[PDB]
Amino acid sequence: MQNDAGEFVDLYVPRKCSASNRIIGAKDHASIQMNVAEVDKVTGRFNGQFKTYAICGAIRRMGESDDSILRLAKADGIVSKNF
Amino acid sequence: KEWLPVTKLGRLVKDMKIKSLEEIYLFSLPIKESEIIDFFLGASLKDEVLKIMPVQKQTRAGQRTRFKAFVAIGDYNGHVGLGVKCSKEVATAIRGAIILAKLSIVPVRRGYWGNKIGKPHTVPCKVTGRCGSVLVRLIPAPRGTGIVSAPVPKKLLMMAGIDDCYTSARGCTATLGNFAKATFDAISKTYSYLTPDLWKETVFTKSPYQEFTDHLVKTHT
Amino acid sequence: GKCRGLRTARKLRSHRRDQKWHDKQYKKAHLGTALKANPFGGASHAKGIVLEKVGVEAKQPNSAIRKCVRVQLIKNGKKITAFVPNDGCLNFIEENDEVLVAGFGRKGHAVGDIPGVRFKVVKVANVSLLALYKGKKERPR
Amino acid sequence: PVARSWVCRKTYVTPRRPFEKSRLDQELKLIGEYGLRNKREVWRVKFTLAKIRKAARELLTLDEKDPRRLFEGNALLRRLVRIGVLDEGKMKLDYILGLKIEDFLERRLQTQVFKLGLAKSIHHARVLIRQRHIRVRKQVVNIPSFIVRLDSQKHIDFSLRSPYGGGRPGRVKRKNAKKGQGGAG
RNA sequence: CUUUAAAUCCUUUAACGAGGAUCCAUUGGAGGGCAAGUCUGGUGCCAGCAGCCGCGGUAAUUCCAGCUCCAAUAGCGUAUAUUAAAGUUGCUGCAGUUAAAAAGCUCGUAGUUGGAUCUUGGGAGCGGCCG
């Protein structure tokens, strides 16, 4: 959070949901930080860096999490266009 | 007298590898081991007991009464907590309530009123909390007005570090435990509110599991 | 509200008047029969004369005989049952004496454990009962 | 038809809760620290601070670049500077709300006489105000409820009709000397 | 001395005027609300206390008296109208299945409320598309 001195007086910044554009609470223990590896650009290996996502609890309560992961991997560059 | 951790969280915070509990709040890690707060929060933490309510069963051979303890915990510049424990012995009730109040600790953030000068002192927006029929409202106030409420959210907001509030209670307020839980739920929804401040799409840092799995693969089995 | 249009006001005034008339305390405060049935008639205190001193029983959970003074008013002339407040102060009030009768505090209603008696006595023979209790003055013979 | 004023106001106010621990203990701590006679004085100072805070809030609820708001804010800032409670480093309308009751009670004449080294105790300072011993700018003050302004702080000294700062000795010294001279002669 | 049509009101000033200041600070309370004793004697459902719950039946943290105690303290307590508390009159801002509360149903004159659409865009120029 801003100030007239140009300093961040807020103690920490919570993360954001990648499927609902919401704020993850500290007591919300249903939030998922999925890690997805990428394949090597040459033949088949793992390059080393990590590609991660996030999701909130209420989506997983309702159920539409698999579609969210599918569109995130499709627009990110993992799933092919035809699918 | 020496704490031995059970889960990996206690081992990671005991082996001086986890810096603070701020990233524990950031990654929403489930806290279930009691003295993580004792390792992280120092001597600024204090405690006070709200009310003791006796509840009775009914049996063919008389009635059995057990204590129900309500407690409010938190350092005066930082976080809060709450704990409800029921036991036959009053000392075990207070001890279990203290342990549960150290367990359920939430982070809070503070805003300004109009002018963005100095340190924050009040709630950023109009938040609320409900349980049963109790409806507790929080309205931001100008600096130096002081918190205007009943005595128990007064002491809760003085251990919350927030100096200025306006309240509006509804329903049966005479149940002190439900009223305390309602204002705790009101103060717990401070971070669950989207603002134009937090419109930035945040970046992802390394998870404590992802960076300490090389340690916990050989620390304990 | 329910009538919530831009050009409706008189319906809201009539409904507010009717629903305020359906209240109980405002009906007690704005009708002449409640002030007429009250023996004081809007007076905080009223003087009267003593014709008989008869005690009355208590309620169920306690058993005592708290003695009361029946006082006929002067401004109206009706038989009103008062109640002596303190202990050992009944003997100060005798027959055909001048007393000052005031209520007890519950807006003109029965109070505590005394049935049908609503008012109390503050002065007798132009001297207060507290002075006779504390020994600050004497009864004028 | 008479030529009378009938302009009176209540300076002290009473809180709603009569018996609570924190307010009574804090008011008693202020009374013991600053030598107040009763809680009416600290209630009066709290009411004046509340009126100043209400004026500040009624000025912050107006927008900028307005002549009335700027004039009232500037005049309030000059008054709060001239009563000596604030410093010239932070002279803005938003700092009016960040004032304490000890800031107002520090500018009292009793605490000023106690802090200038001309009095030993706080109660002794209150007595010395009430005993008509000192003066400011050749004018004696017998009242402890005085707000000392900033430009008149170095003009505080004992009165010329006082035996402490130079004057006629009091009644006790002449009585003791007369008794000793009568006993000797 | 001054003031006033002369005094009495205030200010000023000679002379007296305190050491247990006796030159006496009182008023309600002490179970809870509500700050304040498991102190001591008396009657022990009688006398009484208590705005409400309640306290009195032979060991009363409440009755009647002594000390201590707590609140404002030259002030404190009681009665009676009134306001905030009352989101229990709800326009802001109530409730209508079960706590009080949707007419047996429908038509219908007053009253309240009522679908979309009719003029966009530009340049000179203060400048690194636009205030």
Side-chain angles (χ1 to χ4, degrees):
Chain A
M1 182 179 72
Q2 301 325 290
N3 208 320
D4 294 2
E7 61 86 20
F8 270 37
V9 75
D10 201 331
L11 73 165
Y12 90 107
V13 176
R15 325 172 321 288
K16 300 210 66 52
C17 182
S18 301
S20 63
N21 190 359
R22 293 179 186 182
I23 309 178
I24 301 299
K27 274 312 281 203
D28 188 21
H29 291 333
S31 67
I32 301 299
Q33 190 169 4
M34 181 75 68
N35 272 256
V36 172
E38 76 280 339
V39 75
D40 192 54
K41 65 179 73 174
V42 176
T43 54
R45 293 292 182 269
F46 170 58
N47 304 93
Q49 72 259 53
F50 314 127
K51 187 65 85 143
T52 177
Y53 299 127
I55 204 168
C56 83
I59 297 169
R60 315 176 67 245
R61 301 301 301 272
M62 185 179 288
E64 271 76 60
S65 169
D66 52 28
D67 219 353
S68 296
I69 299 298
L70 202 173
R71 313 191 310 82
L72 279 179
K74 187 201 170 251
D76 197 1
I78 309 299
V79 182
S80 296
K81 178 160 101 172
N82 44 2
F83 172 63
Chain B
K1 70 160 92 79
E2 161 88 354
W3 158 48
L4 272 296
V6 178
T7 62
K8 43 195 65 155
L9 278 81
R11 270 301 298 118
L12 284 181
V13 303
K14 202 189 173 182
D15 209 0
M16 57 203 100
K17 293 200 171 196
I18 287 186
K19 183 57 74 213
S20 170
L21 81 167
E22 294 293 328
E23 68 273 16
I24 297 169
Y25 293 151
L26 191 145
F27 284 104
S28 79
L29 208 49
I31 297 178
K32 265 298 293 168
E33 195 276 333
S34 52
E35 60 275 59
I36 306 177
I37 307 298
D38 292 331
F39 185 76
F40 279 141
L41 269 74
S44 185
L45 187 147
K46 292 184 291 294
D47 201 4
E48 192 274 9
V49 170
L50 307 182
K51 210 188 190 180
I52 302 298
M53 293 177 70
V55 298
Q56 326 168 343
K57 279 89 72 177
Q58 219 280 329
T59 301
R60 32 178 300 186
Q63 58 194 333
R64 185 74 193 110
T65 70
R66 42 189 202 163
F67 291 108
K68 180 184 285 292
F70 297 98
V71 68
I73 191 167
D75 62 357
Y76 273 40
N77 187 276
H79 315 271
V80 285
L82 201 80
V84 184
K85 191 65 181 175
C86 197
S87 80
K88 313 168 179 183
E89 171 76 279
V90 62
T92 66
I94 301 299
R95 197 90 39 81
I98 283 178
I99 289 304
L100 275 183
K102 291 152 89 62
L103 276 194
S104 62
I105 287 181
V106 291
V108 292
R109 67 193 296 249
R110 300 157 278 183
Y112 296 96
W113 192 86
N115 204 15
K116 199 162 299 176
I117 175 64
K119 274 89 201 174
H121 65 91
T122 185
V123 285
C125 64
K126 300 185 171 187
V127 298
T128 179
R130 302 196 82 260
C131 53
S133 82
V134 193
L135 172 53
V136 172
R137 205 179 182 185
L138 271 183
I139 313 296
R143 185 190 306 273
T145 52
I147 45 178
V148 185
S149 56
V152 65
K154 189 173 169 67
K155 57 179 59 53
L156 277 169
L157 270 299
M158 293 183 286
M159 42 205 68
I162 297 169
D163 291 331
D164 299 301
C165 298
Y166 282 126
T167 49
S168 172
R170 210 191 157 271
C172 171
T173 301
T175 63
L176 277 296
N178 261 329
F179 182 76
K181 278 193 175 184
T183 177
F184 198 37
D185 186 74
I187 210 166
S188 79
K189 291 183 182 294
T190 300
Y191 268 95
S192 176
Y193 213 78
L194 193 41
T195 54
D197 187 339
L198 282 72
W199 273 2
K200 182 264 290 180
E201 192 46 60
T202 188
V203 299
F204 283 91
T205 61
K206 203 169 285 284
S207 177
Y209 289 112
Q210 218 183 31
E211 72 197 10
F212 291 163
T213 185
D214 44 1
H215 184 60
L216 64 92
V217 72
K218 81 157 194 176
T219 298
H220 64 286
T221 74
Chain C
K2 177 157 282 297
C3 299
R4 294 179 67 188
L6 182 63
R7 277 151 37 87
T8 187
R10 261 187 297 210
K11 188 77 159 63
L12 286 176
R13 303 291 291 300
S14 300
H15 183 245
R16 183 53 56 238
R17 281 199 281 107
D18 210 347
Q19 288 322 294
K20 201 176 296 185
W21 260 84
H22 271 267
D23 202 1
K24 182 62 66 68
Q25 176 263 349
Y26 164 101
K27 198 174 192 188
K28 298 293 183 182
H30 286 264
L31 276 296
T33 180
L35 191 83
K36 184 246 184 178
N38 169 258
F40 278 179
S44 51
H45 309 263
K47 260 162 211 197
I49 62 170
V50 170
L51 73 163
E52 47 195 4
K53 317 195 305 185
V54 184
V56 76
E57 323 173 308
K59 282 191 184 171
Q60 174 45 289
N62 69 354
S63 178
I65 308 300
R66 290 164 197 83
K67 264 68 61 179
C68 316
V69 186
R70 177 167 283 266
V71 170
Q72 187 190 10
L73 294 174
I74 307 176
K75 48 150 62 182
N76 308 117
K78 300 289 94 176
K79 317 182 200 66
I80 301 299
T81 314
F83 169 65
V84 62
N86 275 311
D87 168 72
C89 287
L90 172 54
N91 45 11
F92 300 139
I93 295 91
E94 294 293 328
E95 271 59 48
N96 300 334
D97 291 331
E98 182 65 26
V99 299
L100 183 51
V101 177
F104 182 76
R106 271 198 65 189
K107 78 175 84 184
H109 199 240
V111 62
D113 59 356
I114 301 299
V117 176
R118 303 181 295 272
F119 322 120
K120 72 180 174 186
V121 181
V122 57
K123 289 168 61 179
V124 61
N126 208 357
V127 67
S128 54
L129 277 296
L130 195 59
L132 307 185
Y133 203 99
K134 298 184 67 64
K136 326 199 73 172
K137 279 192 177 188
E138 211 72 15
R139 194 211 201 298
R141 311 298 292 172
Chain D
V2 290
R4 262 68 181 265
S5 187
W6 316 310
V7 190
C8 53
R9 70 201 323 159
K10 278 181 54 57
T11 306
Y12 74 105
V13 288
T14 69
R16 170 187 166 185
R17 255 164 181 82
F19 306 125
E20 69 275 16
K21 318 298 292 174
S22 182
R23 187 196 46 84
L24 291 175
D25 291 331
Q26 282 286 19
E27 272 151 358
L28 188 43
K29 180 162 295 189
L30 267 295
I31 278 180
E33 182 145 8
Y34 286 138
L36 313 177
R37 186 175 80 102
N38 55 4
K39 314 256 177 176
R40 190 174 288 167
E41 305 184 1
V42 68
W43 284 351
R44 153 183 76 200
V45 176
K46 187 167 62 180
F47 188 75
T48 55
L49 190 148
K51 273 189 302 179
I52 288 188
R53 284 193 62 97
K54 198 196 77 172
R57 188 191 312 127
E58 281 325 313
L59 282 177
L60 276 296
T61 188
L62 267 297
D63 291 331
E64 278 154 2
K65 314 173 311 273
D66 182 80
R68 200 200 78 87
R69 186 250 187 192
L70 278 169
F71 194 11
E72 291 326 280
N74 193 17
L76 206 53
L77 275 158
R78 299 271 142 190
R79 271 147 38 86
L80 267 295
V81 161
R82 92 168 307 184
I83 62 170
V85 59
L86 277 184
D87 47 342
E88 293 274 45
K90 314 189 305 300
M91 187 195 107
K92 273 188 170 302
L93 192 61
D94 81 7
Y95 301 121
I96 301 299
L97 296 180
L99 262 70
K100 294 162 31 63
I101 197 160
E102 301 86 0
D103 292 330
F104 271 40
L105 286 175
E106 195 38 69
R107 297 309 299 168
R108 207 172 160 93
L109 188 48
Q110 178 173 323
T111 78
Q112 189 75 212
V113 173
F114 169 63
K115 284 302 187 307
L116 280 174
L118 273 79
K120 300 289 94 175
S121 300
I122 298 105
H123 310 85
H124 178 223
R126 182 167 182 93
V127 166
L128 206 72
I129 301 299
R130 200 56 189 166
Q131 275 274 344
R132 316 169 62 157
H133 264 286
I134 65 168
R135 56 162 188 83
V136 294
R137 284 179 176 172
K138 315 158 303 177
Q139 216 281 325
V140 286
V141 179
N142 313 341
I143 299 154
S145 70
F146 203 100
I147 298 143
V148 192
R149 53 185 65 249
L150 183 57
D151 57 354
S152 168
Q153 198 177 355
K154 296 176 294 305
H155 286 87
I156 300 170
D157 46 352
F158 289 100
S159 78
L160 270 299
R161 303 205 53 83
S162 165
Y164 292 154
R168 206 171 84 110
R171 204 262 304 277
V172 193
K173 177 165 281 293
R174 58 187 79 256
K175 187 77 150 50
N176 287 22
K178 195 171 192 173
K179 281 196 307 298
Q181 283 155 352

